[PDB]
PDB file of C-alpha atoms in Angstrom:
ATOM      1  CA  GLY A 280     -21.242  11.651   2.808  1.00 15.32           C
ATOM      2  CA  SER A 281     -18.964   9.394   4.707  1.00 19.10           C
ATOM      3  CA  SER A 282     -20.199   8.231   7.998  1.00 20.45           C
ATOM      4  CA  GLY A 283     -19.370   4.365  10.075  1.00 20.32           C
ATOM      5  CA  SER A 284     -22.142   2.155  11.188  1.00 18.40           C
ATOM      6  CA  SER A 285     -22.571   0.716  14.816  1.00 21.87           C
ATOM      7  CA  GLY A 286     -20.117  -2.320  15.670  1.00 21.99           C
ATOM      8  CA  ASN A 287     -16.847  -3.405  13.809  1.00 23.26           C
ATOM      9  CA  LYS A 288     -16.474  -3.359  10.397  1.00 22.67           C
ATOM     10  CA  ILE A 289     -16.297  -7.657   8.124  1.00 23.93           C
ATOM     11  CA  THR A 290     -13.290  -6.040   6.493  1.00 27.71           C
ATOM     12  CA  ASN A 291     -10.306  -6.816   8.646  1.00 27.45           C
ATOM     13  CA  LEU A 292      -6.938  -4.895   8.159  1.00 29.88           C
ATOM     14  CA  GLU A 293      -5.181  -3.961  11.286  1.00 30.89           C
ATOM     15  CA  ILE A 294      -4.305  -7.954  11.788  1.00 28.26           C
ATOM     16  CA  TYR A 295      -1.417  -7.346   9.381  1.00 29.15           C
ATOM     17  CA  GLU A 296       1.110  -5.700   8.889  1.00 28.08           C
ATOM     18  CA  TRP A 297       1.843  -3.512   5.466  1.00 26.29           C
ATOM     19  CA  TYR A 298      -0.865  -1.745   6.487  1.00 27.82           C
ATOM     20  CA  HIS A 299       0.111   1.818   7.975  1.00 31.74           C
ATOM     21  CA  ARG A 300      -3.083   2.849   9.769  1.00 34.15           C
ATOM     22  CA  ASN A 301      -3.375   6.080  11.698  1.00 33.76           C
ATOM     23  CA  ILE A 302      -1.163   7.735   9.551  1.00 31.15           C
ATOM     24  CA  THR A 303      -0.457   9.934   6.847  1.00 28.42           C
ATOM     25  CA  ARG A 304       2.023  10.944   3.329  1.00 30.59           C
ATOM     26  CA  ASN A 305       4.534  11.906   5.866  1.00 34.74           C
ATOM     27  CA  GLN A 306       4.559   8.896   7.225  1.00 35.97           C
ATOM     28  CA  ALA A 307       3.781   6.333   4.646  1.00 38.08           C
ATOM     29  CA  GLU A 308       6.694   8.045   2.473  1.00 36.51           C
ATOM     30  CA  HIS A 309       9.514   8.611   5.420  1.00 34.15           C
ATOM     31  CA  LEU A 310       8.574   4.665   5.981  1.00 32.73           C
ATOM     32  CA  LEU A 311      10.128   4.143   3.552  1.00 32.95           C
ATOM     33  CA  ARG A 312      12.527   6.361   3.137  1.00 33.10           C
ATOM     34  CA  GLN A 313      13.683   3.915   6.065  1.00 34.11           C
ATOM     35  CA  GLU A 314      14.147   1.077   3.961  1.00 31.25           C
ATOM     36  CA  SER A 315      14.907   2.494   0.446  1.00 31.60           C
ATOM     37  CA  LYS A 316      15.069  -0.421  -0.941  1.00 30.46           C
ATOM     38  CA  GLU A 317      13.246  -1.391  -4.066  1.00 30.21           C
ATOM     39  CA  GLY A 318       9.636  -2.908  -3.116  1.00 32.94           C
ATOM     40  CA  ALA A 319       9.317  -1.527   0.153  1.00 31.60           C
ATOM     41  CA  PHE A 320       5.486  -1.007   0.146  1.00 34.04           C
ATOM     42  CA  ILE A 321       2.855  -0.493   2.160  1.00 33.97           C
ATOM     43  CA  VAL A 322      -1.304   0.335   3.124  1.00 33.82           C
ATOM     44  CA  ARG A 323      -2.584   3.853   4.264  1.00 33.42           C
ATOM     45  CA  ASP A 324      -5.928   5.182   4.431  1.00 36.37           C
ATOM     46  CA  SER A 325      -6.866   8.327   2.696  1.00 34.98           C
ATOM     47  CA  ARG A 326      -8.045  10.961   4.746  1.00 32.99           C
ATOM     48  CA  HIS A 327      -9.738  12.488   1.774  1.00 31.97           C
ATOM     49  CA  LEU A 328     -12.379   9.439   1.601  1.00 32.82           C
ATOM     50  CA  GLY A 329     -12.503   6.417   2.854  1.00 32.88           C
ATOM     51  CA  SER A 330     -10.462   4.373   0.100  1.00 31.96           C
ATOM     52  CA  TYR A 331      -6.818   3.297   0.561  1.00 32.81           C
ATOM     53  CA  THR A 332      -3.026   3.778  -0.983  1.00 32.97           C
ATOM     54  CA  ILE A 333      -0.249   2.042  -1.275  1.00 31.98           C
ATOM     55  CA  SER A 334       3.200   3.063  -1.036  1.00 29.57           C
ATOM     56  CA  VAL A 335       6.012   2.072  -2.501  1.00 31.78           C
ATOM     57  CA  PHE A 336       9.569   2.341  -2.978  1.00 29.43           C
ATOM     58  CA  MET A 337      11.304   2.852  -6.445  1.00 29.65           C
ATOM     59  CA  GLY A 338      14.305   4.382  -5.471  1.00 29.26           C
ATOM     60  CA  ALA A 339      16.499   6.750  -7.829  1.00 29.45           C
ATOM     61  CA  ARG A 340      18.348   4.766 -10.775  1.00 32.84           C
ATOM     62  CA  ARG A 341      22.026   4.969  -9.847  1.00 33.05           C
ATOM     63  CA  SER A 342      20.962   4.388  -5.596  1.00 35.16           C
ATOM     64  CA  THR A 343      22.003   7.611  -5.862  1.00 34.45           C
ATOM     65  CA  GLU A 344      18.509   9.048  -4.817  1.00 35.60           C
ATOM     66  CA  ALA A 345      15.006   8.011  -2.810  1.00 35.09           C
ATOM     67  CA  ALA A 346      11.942   7.185  -5.181  1.00 37.69           C
ATOM     68  CA  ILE A 347       7.807   6.910  -3.942  1.00 35.64           C
ATOM     69  CA  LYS A 348       4.999   6.159  -5.910  1.00 33.04           C
ATOM     70  CA  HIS A 349       1.255   6.597  -4.569  1.00 35.58           C
ATOM     71  CA  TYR A 350      -1.046   4.110  -6.514  1.00 32.97           C
ATOM     72  CA  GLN A 351      -5.132   4.668  -5.402  1.00 33.38           C
ATOM     73  CA  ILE A 352      -6.394   2.358  -4.666  1.00 30.81           C
ATOM     74  CA  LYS A 353     -10.316   2.759  -6.473  1.00 28.69           C
ATOM     75  CA  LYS A 354     -14.087   0.598  -7.026  1.00 26.88           C
ATOM     76  CA  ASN A 355     -15.033   0.218  -9.988  1.00 27.85           C
ATOM     77  CA  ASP A 356     -19.718  -0.454 -10.466  1.00 26.35           C
ATOM     78  CA  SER A 357     -19.018  -4.236  -9.540  1.00 26.21           C
ATOM     79  CA  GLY A 358     -17.786  -2.577  -6.294  1.00 32.00           C
ATOM     80  CA  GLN A 359     -14.155  -3.899  -7.388  1.00 33.69           C
ATOM     81  CA  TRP A 360     -11.128  -2.786  -5.632  1.00 38.06           C
ATOM     82  CA  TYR A 361      -8.373  -2.014  -7.851  1.00 40.27           C
ATOM     83  CA  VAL A 362      -4.234  -0.374  -8.548  1.00 42.51           C
ATOM     84  CA  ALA A 363      -3.829  -0.740 -11.755  1.00 42.46           C
ATOM     85  CA  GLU A 364      -7.075  -0.655 -13.536  1.00 45.70           C
ATOM     86  CA  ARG A 365      -7.013  -4.175 -14.827  1.00 47.25           C
ATOM     87  CA  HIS A 366      -7.645  -6.320 -12.297  1.00 45.14           C
ATOM     88  CA  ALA A 367     -10.264  -6.002  -9.348  1.00 46.46           C
ATOM     89  CA  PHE A 368     -10.252  -7.610  -6.483  1.00 47.94           C
ATOM     90  CA  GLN A 369     -13.341  -8.609  -4.011  1.00 48.28           C
ATOM     91  CA  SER A 370     -10.968  -7.798  -1.155  1.00 45.32           C
ATOM     92  CA  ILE A 371      -7.901  -4.839  -0.655  1.00 45.09           C
ATOM     93  CA  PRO A 372      -5.928  -7.808   1.347  1.00 44.90           C
ATOM     94  CA  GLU A 373      -6.671  -9.765  -1.762  1.00 45.31           C
ATOM     95  CA  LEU A 374      -5.758  -7.245  -4.948  1.00 43.01           C
ATOM     96  CA  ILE A 375      -2.346  -7.414  -2.640  1.00 41.20           C
ATOM     97  CA  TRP A 376      -1.936 -11.579  -2.491  1.00 38.77           C
ATOM     98  CA  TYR A 377      -1.240 -11.956  -5.579  1.00 39.27           C
ATOM     99  CA  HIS A 378       0.142  -8.624  -6.624  1.00 41.02           C
ATOM    100  CA  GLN A 379       2.512  -9.818  -3.787  1.00 41.42           C
ATOM    101  CA  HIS A 380       3.546 -13.310  -6.341  1.00 39.65           C
ATOM    102  CA  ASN A 381       3.352 -10.952  -9.287  1.00 38.56           C
ATOM    103  CA  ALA A 382       3.065  -7.791  -9.972  1.00 38.10           C
ATOM    104  CA  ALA A 383       0.436  -6.847 -12.984  1.00 38.81           C
ATOM    105  CA  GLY A 384       0.509  -4.029 -13.288  1.00 42.45           C
ATOM    106  CA  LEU A 385       3.407  -1.978 -14.477  1.00 41.17           C
ATOM    107  CA  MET A 386       4.608  -2.323 -10.751  1.00 39.39           C
ATOM    108  CA  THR A 387       7.703  -3.573  -8.990  1.00 37.64           C
ATOM    109  CA  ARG A 388       7.076  -6.951  -7.708  1.00 39.64           C
ATOM    110  CA  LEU A 389       6.503  -6.064  -3.810  1.00 40.51           C
ATOM    111  CA  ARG A 390       9.703  -8.096  -2.244  1.00 41.74           C
ATOM    112  CA  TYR A 391       9.135  -6.077   1.706  1.00 41.61           C
ATOM    113  CA  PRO A 392       6.434  -5.633   3.274  1.00 43.79           C
ATOM    114  CA  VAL A 393       6.762  -2.988   5.776  1.00 41.28           C
ATOM    115  CA  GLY A 394       4.884  -4.006   8.404  1.00 44.31           C
ATOM    116  CA  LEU A 395       3.424  -1.164  11.342  1.00 45.33           C
ATOM    117  CA  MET A 396       6.949  -2.505  13.558  1.00 46.16           C
ATOM    118  CA  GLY A 397       9.283  -1.364  11.304  1.00 45.76           C
ATOM    119  CA  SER A 398      12.913  -2.953  11.229  1.00 44.48           C
ATOM    120  CA  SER A 399      14.629   0.928  12.547  1.00 45.09           C
ATOM    121  CA  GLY A 400      15.701   3.968  11.884  1.00 44.38           C
ATOM    122  CA  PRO A 401      17.401   7.369  12.857  1.00 43.74           C
ATOM    123  CA  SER A 402      15.694  10.669  14.507  1.00 45.10           C
ATOM    124  CA  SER A 403      15.934  13.442  13.571  1.00 44.76           C
ATOM    125  CA  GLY A 404      18.901  16.417  15.427  1.00 44.08           C
TER     126      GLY A 404
END
């Protein structure tokens, strides 16, 4: 089971921008699609569980199509978050703290930290 508690939680992500909360698969990807540039990454919650998933834009090879990956952040017995299942951290905002400078997990070096306030994008129709 999963039931929150009374009051605000210690962990604060909303403060950041790369932490896209209150979104869904479509949103995560959609946002990246707008950037369509290697690096565009983000962080959302797993409607399934109280976890967090990182959505990065890989982009096709011949820049002809779009590519978006989804790295689910799991936790080990040591209650540490990890994406590459090789480097465990103590806080969510800590795992990406380094990654940004150096992936360190067969992942692209985050370049464009897609934040809540997106740059700009046209509307369907």
